[PDB]
Swiss-Prot record:
<dbReference type="GO" id="GO:0009253">
    <property type="term" value="P:peptidoglycan catabolic process"/>
</dbReference>
<dbReference type="GO" id="GO:0016998">
    <property type="term" value="P:cell wall macromolecule catabolic process"/>
</dbReference>
<keyword id="KW-0578">Host cell lysis by virus</keyword>
<feature type="binding site">
    <location>
        <position position="117"/>
    </location>
    <ligand>
        <name>substrate</name>
    </ligand>
</feature>
<comment type="similarity">
    <text>Belongs to the glycosyl hydrolase 24 family.</text>
</comment>
<dbReference type="GO" id="GO:0044659">
    <property type="term" value="P:viral release from host cell by cytolysis"/>
</dbReference>
<keyword id="KW-0204">Cytolysis</keyword>
<dbReference type="InterPro" id="IPR002196">
    <property type="entry name" value="Glyco_hydro_24"/>
</dbReference>
<comment type="function">
    <text>Endolysin with lysozyme activity that degrades host peptidoglycans and participates with the holin and spanin proteins in the sequential events which lead to the programmed host cell lysis releasing the mature viral particles. Once the holin has permeabilized the host cell membrane, the endolysin can reach the periplasm and break down the peptidoglycan layer.</text>
</comment>
<feature type="binding site">
    <location>
        <position position="32"/>
    </location>
    <ligand>
        <name>substrate</name>
    </ligand>
</feature>
<feature type="binding site">
    <location>
        <position position="104"/>
    </location>
    <ligand>
        <name>substrate</name>
    </ligand>
</feature>
<feature type="active site" description="Proton donor/acceptor">
    <location>
        <position position="20"/>
    </location>
</feature>
<dbReference type="GO" id="GO:0003796">
    <property type="term" value="F:lysozyme activity"/>
</dbReference>
<feature type="binding site">
    <location>
        <position position="132"/>
    </location>
    <ligand>
        <name>substrate</name>
    </ligand>
</feature>
<dbReference type="InterPro" id="IPR023346">
    <property type="entry name" value="Lysozyme-like_dom_sf"/>
</dbReference>
<feature type="active site" description="Proton donor/acceptor">
    <location>
        <position position="11"/>
    </location>
</feature>
<protein>
    <recommendedName>
        <fullName>Endolysin</fullName>
        <ecNumber>3.2.1.17</ecNumber>
    </recommendedName>
</protein>
Length: 162
């Protein structure tokens, strides 16, 4: 199991513009287009993103290209982020994937705000960190996905995904 396979499981794949769990305009593999209510604002960002006239529809390849960029951006952001880098460096391979998973989902800014949880992960206090992460709007809104990531952190294995 790898990061791409993990996120493909959590985000799904859709070739037509759609609304995410939060109501925002998304396409492909969790690729957020805009927070704006307008489908037109979305369709424009989409053509900007692909470099063609899409009229809200893309190919598998295009969805994958976008997915490649996003995971990459997610990894570079963690590495560049002063609060995230140290946690990431302190972690094993599996748990590293889990942190990338949250960053792709909520952005660098959101994860960086989970101060207490980050501190417990860095300290390797698994169980405590798992209970703390569950106390968030994130877990309340997408419980099944949150549980999967959280177990990944608690255990250090791909069990939740297999
Ligand atoms: Cl809460
Ligand atoms: Cl969910």
């Amino acid at each position: 199991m790898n990061i791409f396979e993990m996120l493909r499981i959590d985000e799904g794949l859709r070739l037509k513009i759609y609304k995410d769990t939060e109501g925002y305009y998304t396409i492909g593999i969790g690729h957020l287009l805009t927070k704006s209510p307008s489908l037109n604002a979305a369709k424009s960002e989409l053509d900007k993103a692909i470099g063609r006239n899409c009229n809200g529809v893309i190919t598998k390849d295009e969805a994958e290209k976008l997915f490649n960029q996003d995971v990459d951006a997610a990894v570079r952001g963690i590495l560049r982020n002063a609060k995230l880098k140290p946690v990431y460096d302190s972690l094993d391979a599996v748990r590293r994937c889990a942190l990338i998973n949250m960053v792709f989902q909520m952005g660098e800014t959101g994860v960086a705000g989970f101060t207490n949880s980050l501190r417990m992960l860095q300290q390797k206090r698994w169980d405590e960190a798992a209970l703390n992460l569950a106390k968030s709007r994130w877990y309340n809104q997408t419980p099944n996905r949150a549980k999967r990531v959280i177990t990944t952190f608690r255990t250090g294995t791909w069990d939740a995904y297999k």
